[PDB]
């Protein structure tokens, strides 16, 4: 080499920094990122019992780390900060079944997020929170409160089926995404397991798509 001693020492320092960057990147690679969205009353803050900037939550279930980001605090225009979340595994959308106006702007937000120009290859885990409470409420009063055009009996089955069919029918990019809908019980113990299953399935689909086998 034509270097001096100090130049060689600087090169050695740079190599050490490169090694540290490699280890940190490989460590950060072993994680799953989720975009937690929904109304303020949806219950997103209590979605997983395992537990102003972006709201961040982290949990590990069955040897898999998950970082959920809530970005409802950011009240600026979403167009100029939504591209920072294009490289995430899935969008977890929580809907409040009981409240009617809440679920209405929940449909608005669902359509807005699903029809973005960035999230054209990402899927939604749709948690229909407040299942049985809204079931009793719909026993008391029909779904005509918000879904006025909808015609159905007072049974919970028809109303819940219509609501799920709606929330899946606002979707337009059905070619490269798939919604995973889950009726959320008050004491549901399958939430983390459901997220695990959905993440594994979508990662398998991602392998299939890059390898061209899908």
């Amino acid at each position: 080499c034509t270097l001096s001693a100090e130049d060689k020492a600087a090169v050695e320092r740079s190599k050490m920094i490169d090694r540290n960057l490699r280890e940190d990147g490989e460590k950060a690679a072993r994680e799953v990122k989720l975009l937690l969205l929904g109304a303020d009353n949806s219950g997103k803050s209590t979605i997983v019992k395992q537990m102003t900037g972006i709201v961040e939550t982290h949990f590990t279930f069955k040897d898999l780390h998950f970082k959920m980001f809530d970005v409802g605090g950011q009240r600026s225009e979403r167009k100029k900060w939504i591209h920072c979340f294009e490289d995430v595994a899935a969008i977890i959308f929580c809907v409040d079944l009981s409240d009617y106006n809440r679920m209405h702007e929940s449909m608005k937000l669902f359509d807005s997020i699903c029809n973005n120009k960035w999230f054209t290859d990402t899927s939604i885990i749709l948690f229909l929170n407040k299942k049985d409470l809204f079931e009793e409420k719909i026993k008391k009063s029909p779904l005509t409160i918000c879904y006025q055009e909808y015609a159905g009996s007072n049974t919970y089955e028809e109303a819940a089926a219509y609501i799920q069919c709606q929330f899946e029918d606002l979707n337009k990019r059905k070619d490269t995404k798939e919604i995973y809908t889950h009726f959320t019980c008050a004491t549901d113990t399958k939430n983390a397991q459901f997220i695990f299953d959905a993440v594994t399935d979508v990662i398998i689909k991602n392998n299939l798509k890059d390898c061209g086998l899908f």
Partner: peptide, 24 residues
């Protein structure tokens, strides 16, 4: 031969939906 059969007769299994469901 079986893939030839499925391709030419009974095209109904030749959609992305079948593969997507089977993988899951």
């Amino acid at each position: 031969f079986n893939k030839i059969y499925i391709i030419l007769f009974k095209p109904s299994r030749n959609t992305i939906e079948e593969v997507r469901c089977s993988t899951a």
